[PDB]
From Swiss-Prot:
This is Protease NS2. Its cofactor is Zn(2+). Disulfide bonds: none annotated. Homodimer. Interacts with envelope glycoprotein E1. Interacts with envelope glycoprotein E2. Interacts with viroporin p7. Interacts with serine protease/helicase NS3. Part of the replication complex composed of NS2, NS3, NS4A, NS4B, NS5A and the RNA-directed RNA polymerase embedded in an ER-derived membranous web. Part of the viral assembly initiation complex composed of NS2, E1, E2, NS3, NS4A, NS5A and the core protein.
Amino acid sequence: HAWYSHYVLKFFLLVFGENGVFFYK
């Protein structure tokens, strides 16, 4: 059972995604 496990994954994907999208030439 996990209802708040997607928030930590969705928020991380947004912050981790910008780290790669803002550093790939």
